[PDB]
Every structure is written in structure tokens, then in C-alpha cells.
Subunit: 397 residues, 2 copies
């Protein structure tokens, strides 16, 4: 069966963000009882105001659709209109910017778990233009976790290992080896996520997933950074900006493989981007869209493909984010229309016959690297109709 993941399927939709409303840096989850909301933010390109509406899909732990019917999981109707929008101001590339907060006055959630918001043009309800995915937690267990570059297979070389315990004194679970499903995500990436974990030990009030070989991740590197807050000067990692009607074009400085080196402390935001422009008080309507040109100078890597990776492509490894190789210049190259701001990014290699991207070949794997890991604990005892999300935590090093 089919999996729901945050992805854009329309060329007219850009800069899809899923974050906690009001937060600069966040994770795509909120508490069921809580005061926080998820914010889905995106632009539609063109001058047209367009009527978009959404459906709520309840999913199980693995992001396949659950068997629940809407009345079981939401209060409110499917096909609600997205009313909160505004036109671009003072930009070459025209667009409208849209914002949906959830839960809201029209839709509230009745159960925990994974949710997928599918958006469409009201005229064309069967063509989904994007899916935005977030989770809703009922936090009845506490998770104590650590990340170390000292792992079971090496010692401060190229890996990081996650270790955690589920503390459940106040939510006893008789058979957690069967009734829990755990997902662990590095830097909000699904491609190299881990699941099918077994506890190393189970006490009455503590379930330990420590020393688990599957919880060893390659360490990667700090993401590459780039900024283009105006067309007047060259921002960070920008070689030149030029205008070719109708767009400004940002030539980024040339990138090189970083795997053959020594770790360099850089401060990143683990693949995130931030929409910003010089002297803009509302970048969501004032930031323009420029063609950004990425260049990775190396010989082509055999037996796989290179993908541009980060929140800028929703961490999706597909034909949109895959990079072609220019054999005239001996470079991987890609042009991407992006809204002005600060971007993290990196280059992942996917070996042929795999769906898992690797930081090793181009970015390198350095145990010191600051990464984040989100641990999602889903609960499903025999006879329950759906996967509850009973704990979640994000740990850094």
C-alpha cells in the first residue's frame, strides 16, 4: 500500500513549509491536547487568486492510510477552503502566499497519530497538488535518549549511534516488543530512517533500545549554506547575480567533495531554510523568486545518482531533486527556482537499486557533526484499530 509524505506535485506550488506555528526552528509534531498548531505555508505562482481546499488523511505509523473514517479522527468536514492568503508585493515573480493552521476553528483532531493534509484546487478535487505531513502526539511516555560518535562498530570515526529508553511507569505496556512501532529519523529524512527495532531489555516501567545495530547512522557533515537576501550584493556562497528576463539568476560558488578532509565546525540548521530579504518586514509576501544555480565539480560517481537534499525539496529523493551531470564542464549542475532567504543544502548519493541516500561520498562522514534525531513511538495493542503516537522526542549532540 501507498505512503504519504510531504511532497509537491504541481509546478505552480513552491516553498511548502510544515512547521509549528510561531516557531523559528521546529519539528513537524504537536500535542493532541496542547495550545500549539501546525502551520502549512506555501506559495501559488501566477497572479490568479485560486481556491484551494484540503482533506485530512489519518495514517498509521508507517505513513500508510489507517482504517479510520473521518468522524473517528476529526471534527469538521473534508474539503475545507484555505482562506488565509495574500498577494506578493514588489517582486518580479508574482505569487500568492497561503497559510493553513491546524487544528483550527473548522477542523480539530480526535486522536493521535500521523496526519496527511492533501491540498487541491476546488475545481479539480481529484488532482492533489501537494501533501503536507505532520504528527499529533498524546505524550504518555517519556523518552530518555543520547547520540554518541562512540558506537558499537567504531570510535569517533564516521558514525553516530542513538540510544534510548522509553519510560512508561504511568503508561504500562504489557508486550512492547509486539505493540510498539518505533521510527527514528535523522535530520528529518525519510530516506535513511530506521524502524523494526527490538528492545534490548524490558522492565515493567522501562523499555531500552540501547546497543541496537540499526541505530547506528552515518554521521555526515554540516550542511552547506547559501543566502541571497537581495540582488544588489553577493550573499554567502554567491559568485554573482545577473538578470535574464523575467528572472534574476543566482550563480552559487562552486561546490566540491568534502569527504577527503578534517571536520570544520560550521553552524547549520540541519537542512532547513528561512525565507528572508533585505529590509523586508513580511518576507512571505516580499521575497522574490530567483533561479538558483548549483554546481558540484567532481568526476561523475559510478553506480548511483546524486540528489540535492534539504527542506528546499522537502527531503524527497526523486526526479525533481536528482542532479544531471554535465560532461562538458565535468560538473553536476542544477537550476532551481527558489524564494529568497538562507538555505541549508547537501548532496546525497543513492547507489543503484537503493532508495537510501548517503552523505559519505560527497559530504563525508565525521563523528563530530551536529545532527538531530527524532524518535517516534507508536502504540498498537491487539484489537486496536490504529497506531497512536504516545511519545516523540528530538535529540541533538
Amino acid at each position: 500500500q501507498v505512503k504519504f509524505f510531504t511532497d509537491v506535485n504541481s509546478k505552480q506550488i513552491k516553498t511548502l513549509q510544515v512547521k509549528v506555528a510561531g516557531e523559528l526552528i521546529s519539528e513537524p509534531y504537536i500535542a493532541l491536547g496542547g495550545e500549539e498548531q501546525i502551520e502549512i505555508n506555501f506559495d501559488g505562482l501566477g497572479s490568479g487568486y485560486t481556491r484551494y481546499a484540503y482533506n485530512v488523511v489519518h495514517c498509521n505509523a508507517d505513513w500508510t492510510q489507517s482504517q479510520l473514517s473521518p468522524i473517528e479522527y476529526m471534527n469538521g468536514f473534508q474539503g475545507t477552503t484555505i482562506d488565509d492568503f495574500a498577494n506578493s508585493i514588489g517582486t518580479t515573480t508574482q505569487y500568492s502566499n497561503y497559510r493553513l493552521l491546524l487544528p483550527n476553528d473548522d477542523v480539530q483532531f480526535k486522536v493521535s497519530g500521523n496526519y496527511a493534509i492533501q491540498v487541491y484546487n476546488e475545481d479539480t478535487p481529484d488532482q492533489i497538488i501537494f501533501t503536507a505531513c505532520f504528527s499529533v502526539v498524546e505524550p504518555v511516555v517519556n523518552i530518555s535518549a543520547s547520540v554518541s560518535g562512540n558506537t558499537d562498530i567504531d570510535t569517533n570515526q564516521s558514525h553516530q549511534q542513538v540510544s534510548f529508553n522509553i519510560n512508561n511507569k504511568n503508561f504500562p505496556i504489557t508486550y512492547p516488543q509486539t505493540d510498539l512501532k518505533i521510527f527514528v529519523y535523522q535530520d528529518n529524512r525519510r530516506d535513511n530512517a530506521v524502524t523494526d527495532l527490538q528492545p534490548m531489555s524490558i522492565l515493567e516501567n522501562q523499555i531500552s533500545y540501547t546497543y541496537n545495530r540499526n541505530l547506528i547512522f552515518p554521521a555526515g557533515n554540516e550542511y552547506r549554506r547559501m543566502e541571497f537576501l537581495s540582488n544588489k550584493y553577493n550573499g554567502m556562497h554567491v559568485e554573482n547575480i545577473s538578470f535574464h528576463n523575467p528572472y534574476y539568476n543566482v550563480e552559487l560558488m562552486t561546490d566540491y567533495r568534502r569527504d577527503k578532509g578534517t571536520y570544520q565546525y560550521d553552524q547549520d540548521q540541519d537542512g532547513r531554510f528561512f525565507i528572508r530579504c533585505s529590509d523586508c518586514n513580511d518576507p512571505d509576501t516580499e521575497a522574490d523568486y530567483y533561479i538558483v544555480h548549483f554546481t558540484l565539480a567532481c568526476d561523475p560517481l559510478p553506480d548511483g545518482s546524486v540528489y540535492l537534499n534539504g527542506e528546499l525539496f522537502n527531503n524527497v529523493l526523486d526526479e525533481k531533486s536528482k542532479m544531471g551531470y554535465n560532461f562538458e564542464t565535468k560538473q553536476y549542475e542544477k537550476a532551481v527556482l527558489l524564494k529568497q532567504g538562507s538555505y541549508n543544502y547537501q548532496y546525497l548519493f543513492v547507489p543503484t537499486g537503493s532508495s537510501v541516500g548517503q552523505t559519505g561520498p560527497i559530504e563525508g562522514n565525521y563523528y563530530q557533526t551536529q545532527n538531530e534525531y527524532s524518535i517516534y513511538v507508536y502504540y498498537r495493542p491487539m484489537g486496536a484499530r490504529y497506531d497512536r503516537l504516545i511519545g516523540v522526542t528530538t535529540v541533538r549532540n
Copy 2:
């Protein structure tokens, strides 16, 4: 027996900092094998260059002196001179700024544990002018930890609870209930630190200190902030600056009790301060010393005393940091000579007949508050002569 703690005992010494050399935000520990150094930084007031020298004291887990002799714990001599110094430039208040990195070319450490650096004027070796304290870890165990406002005694009200496991597959310990000594510190404070912990459970490769009543701390509040980067404008929380020979005087805005309210997200640095001044490229020699005036307007609190708290007084609760009460103005008030920069601070109440400060009465206790907790794991099997520090970690929420 007597305990060593970071403290200044001379009126001519100011702005003692203990941090990891090169780090903006740090903890006062380094790894025994590692590439990092502790930096001890301080000013001596006056124009005089003065010859200061230091001794290294090895301490046990509780910061009493161990039975080790210098040859057992250090390579190098006692009474080494502090050579790295520079005079103030362009400041009303004259001083020299001193910097000692450890380990260095003259002193290296042979064992892990707690170290106290006692500094003195070479002329007067029996009068210690300050002690600077840091720890050296041989990290042979990993600590997985969490902090939650959902505790065993309440639920997202006024407390935080720390939960942790010591993962020791690669450093087996037969009787950890006897051979481990654990200290847990909130926001680098010794006054309300916790120890004498018993494991709730001991497996062959995991020791759990979860659900421990002593590991529940009051949550406190984000520290108050203030900045005075020049005498020209009034910085954050500054009401006015004025000159009364020989010093500039900073009148801080009036502070009030914050316990009767709702949590306000503020970004703090958990009691730290940062030496900075406008257009200064070397604040350590360019930042001036002004008299800063603190005011807390409330009725006097009975059955205890109020102390100004933070890195600015090395988190020491004594006669230096205690606040007098002005019954004319109905305010707690204190004048402190401080080097220009950004300061975190707060006001703690110490009940009479106690040495433990409370955030509750003046700052309030809010479960949301971002705090840090450092967990130090010391190891001493029967017959060992000293407490090794075999693991340490700092966790936030």
C-alpha cells in the same frame, strides 16, 4: 573537610571565567585524552603588572581534596607563573587581563576527576586570591538522559524531572550502587545540586536512575537579562547611565517578582554573561568596568535572604552576592562593579537555616522554562585511591 569551588577571594580580581577555550557557550569540563583546553580568564584591577602563580589540586567527586600527590595527577610543577596577559586599553577603570589554558606546555594531567586551580600573588603564596574549578572526563560510559515538566509529583506545573541511564557495555561495573557517585547540577549551580542517588535498576550493561524523587528540581524561570555595551545609549534593561568620578554608573530598570504570572518565552543563556562593548574587537582588554545598580521592588521576604545569582558571582551564595534591603525605598538593592557586556541574572531566596536557593519566591517556577542539567558520573571501586570521572553529559529541554 573543606570543599573547593569556583570563587574569588580578592577585591582586586574580577570577571573570573572558567570555560572551554574557544567556545562561546560551554561547560567546565574537558576529556582527558582530548584536544580541548580549559580557559581560566580574569582581570586584575590597578595599573600594576603583578606576578600570579597557580597550584593544581586534585579533588574527589564531592570537591574535597583527594589523597593523591601531585606526581600521581599532573606532569609539571606547582607554582607556575601566569604569563599570558595584557593591559586594558581606553577604559576609565584600569586593569590587566589574564588567561591560563589547561592543560598546557607546563602542566598536563595524568588522571580524570575534579581539579581546583588556586591562584596567588607570587609574593604571597599562602594567600589564595581565587580558585577556579573544572573537571576532566575519561568518557568510558555513555549517558542517555531526558528532562520533563511531567514529573512524578506533578504534571506541567512548577517542576522539572531529570531521568537518565548509564550505558556501560564497554565499561562493566560490578556494584554500581556502591562504586558510582553521581552529581547533578541545574544551571551550573552547586547550591541545589543533587547526589546520593540509587539506581532504580541495574542490568549488566545499563544502570537506570529514573523515577528518582531527588531528581525533581523546581523549574524556575528564564534568567533576567541586561546589557551595557557603551555609555552613549541605554542598553537592554538600562534606565540611565551617568558618570560619578571615577566610574560610570548603570541604573538598571526596576525588577519585580515574577512568581504570580504566566510563562513568557525569553531566550537566555542560563546565568552566563558575555564580555562585549560597541566597536570593540578585543572586549577582554577594551571593555570598561562600571558600577551596576540592581533594584528589586517588593516587600521584604521573611525567614530568609535574597541573593543575586548567575555566572557574574560564579553562582556563589554568600556575603558578596547577598542583597541588602532598603526600607526607605522598599527595595532590595545592590551596586556591583561589572565589566561591560550582556548579563543573565536572577534572584534566589535562601530560607533561614538552609544553603539551598529557591527560584520560586521571586522568579517563579514554570515547567516550560529552558534549563540545563549536567550529570557527572564518578567511579570508585574498593581499594581505588581517588574518584575517576567516567562520564558526563549536559541535557536541556
